[PDB]
Amino acid sequence: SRRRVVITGMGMLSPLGLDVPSSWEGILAGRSGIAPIEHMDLSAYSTRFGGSVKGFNVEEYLSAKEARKLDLFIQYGLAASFQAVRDSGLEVTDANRERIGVSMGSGIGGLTNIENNCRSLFEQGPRRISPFFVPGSIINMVSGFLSIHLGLQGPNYALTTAQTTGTHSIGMAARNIAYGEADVMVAGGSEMAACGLGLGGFGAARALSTRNDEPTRASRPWDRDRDGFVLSDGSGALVLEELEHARARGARIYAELVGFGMSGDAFHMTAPPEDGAGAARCMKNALRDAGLDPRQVDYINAHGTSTPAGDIAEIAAVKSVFGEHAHALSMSSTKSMTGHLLGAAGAVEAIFSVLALRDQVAPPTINLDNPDEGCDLDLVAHEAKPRKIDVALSNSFGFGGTNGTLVFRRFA
C-alpha cells in the first residue's frame, strides 16, 4: 500500500506575473505574457520575442552577493521554491528536517551563464571564468541551495527530462512521499533559455514561431496558422505533503495528487508519433495509477506547444484514451498565453491544473481562431469556462519521446 499526497503550497514566476495569484489572474483573463525580448540584440535571429519574467527582484529572496553566484534559472527556481514553502506555512524543525526534501529540475540549465563565461573564455582566456561558474550553473543547485537555506535533509535531487522536467519532478516527488521516503517535497522546475543559444538553438531546428509582427498571436495551439512554440522563462514549485502530516498541522490543502504516469515514445529525437501513442500510454498509466476510469476526467491542461506535429498528436492521444468521453472533458493549452517554459512548463501547468480544481474553471486556449483538421474537441477557445472539475490531468511530452502525466483530484 501507499500514502496519499496533497498540495499545500505553490510558488511561481511566469511571463504573466511574479507569483501564483497574479499569473492565475492573467490565465483566466486570457492575457498574453509574450513580447519582443529586451536588453538583448536579436537582429540576426528569426525569432525576436517570447515570455520573459518582467520585474523580478532577486533581492526579495537572496543578498545581491549570493544572487551574483547563481544563473537566472537557479534564481527563478529558488523564488518559486521560497514562495511555495511560505504558501504552505510549513515549519522545518530538528524533528522533521530529515523528512523534507527537494526535486527542482531544469530542461536546459545554465545557458545564459555558460554564454557569459564563454564570452570571457574566448575574449580573455580561462582566467576570466567565474569561480562560481560550475556550482552557479548546474541544474541540481536549486535543490542544493534550497536545502542549504532551509536546512532540508530529505531526498535532494534534480530531474532533467527536457520539456517534461516539471511534470516528472512533481510525480517522482509524490512517489517519494507515497512510498514513505519523505513526508514533504518541494518539486517543480525552472528555466531561462532566452539567451542566444536558446533562441539560436531552437531557431536552428526551425522549432520556434517566427510571427515577429504579432508576438501575442504567435502561440496558437491547435490553430491551422500555428508555426512552432514560443520560448518562455520562469518557474513553478509545489509543496507536496503526506495527507496525515498535512491534517495534523492544520495545512490548507489545494488538491490531491492521485496519479503519476511516465512512458517513452521510443519514436524520434524531437517529433512525437502522429497517433500520440506515447501520450496515450502515459495518460492510461497515470489513470491506472490513480485507480480512475478515463470517464472521470473533466479537465486536461495539454502540453499544447503550438507546433504542427505536437498539437495534432495530443488530439489523437486524447481520442484514443477517452473514446466517447473525449468531447465531454475540456482541454486547453495555457501555453497559448504563457508560451513554453520548457522544463518549468510542467510545474506552472500543474499549479494551473490545481487552481482549475479550486476555482472550478477551465483556462482558455487563446488565439484558437481556426481549429485545424481533427481539432474538434472542447479546446476552451478564447475565454475561460466555468464547469465541474473533480479530476484534472496535466500532460508533458518532451524531446527523446519522454512523456509525463499528473492526475489531480479535488480534496474536500
Ligand X SMILES: Cc1cccc(NC(=O)[C@@H]2CCCN2)n1
Residue 226 burial (10 A CB sphere; 0-12, 13-18, 19+): buried
The residues, ordered by sequence, that sit 6+ positions from 118 with a Cβ below 8 Å of its Cβ are: none
Site string for a copy of itself, 108-127 (x = CB under 8 A): xx-x--xx-xxx-xxx-xxx
Q: Is 191 in the site for a copy of itself (CB under 8 A)?
A: no
Query: Smallest distance from the beta carbon of 199 to a copy of itself, in angstroms?
Result: 7
Grid cell in block for residue 269: 529525437
| Alpha carbon distance 44, 50 (integer Å) | 16
| Beta carbons of 194 and 52 less than 8 angstroms apart | yes
How far are the Cα atoms of 107, 151, 201 from residue 168, in angstroms, in the given order? 11, 24, 24
| Alpha carbon distance 162, 389 (integer Å) | 29
| Beta carbons of 52 and 38 less than 8 angstroms apart | yes
The residues, ordered by sequence, that sit 6+ positions from 344 with a Cβ below 8 Å of its Cβ are: 76, 106, 107, 165, 166, 188, 189, 190, 191, 233, 234, 235, 236
Query: Smallest distance from the beta carbon of 138 to a copy of itself, in angstroms?
Result: 6
> Site residues for a copy of itself, window 317-336 (CB under 8 A)?
none
| Alpha carbon distance 91, 253 (integer Å) | 16
Grid cell in block for residue 121: 573564455
Q: Pick from 80, 262, 337, 368 the residue near a copy of itself by CB under 8 A.
A: 262
Site string for a copy of itself, 8-47 (x = CB under 8 A): ------------------------------------xx--
Picked from a copy of itself, ligand X, none, the partner binding residue 217 (CB below 5 to 8 A depending on kind) is ligand X
| Beta carbons of 233 and 15 less than 8 angstroms apart | yes
Q: Is 212 in the site for a copy of itself (CB under 8 A)?
A: no
Q: Which is nearer to a copy of itself, 30 or 135 (CB)?
A: 135
Q: Pick from 112, 307, 332, 402 the residue near a copy of itself by CB under 8 A.
A: 402
Q: Pick from 31, 35, 67, 138 the residue near a copy of itself by CB under 8 A.
A: 138
| Beta carbons of 35 and 219 less than 8 angstroms apart | no
Q: Which is nearer to a copy of itself, 79 or 389 (CB)?
A: 79
Which residues are near ligand X by CB under 6 A? 119-120, 123-124, 214, 217, 225, 369
Which range, of 149-157, 220-228, 312-320, 353-361, touches a copy of itself by CB under 8 A?
149-157
Q: Is 157 in the site for a copy of itself (CB under 8 A)?
A: yes
Q: Which is nearer to a copy of itself, 61 or 267 (CB)?
A: 267
Q: Which is nearer to a copy of itself, 29 or 204 (CB)?
A: 204
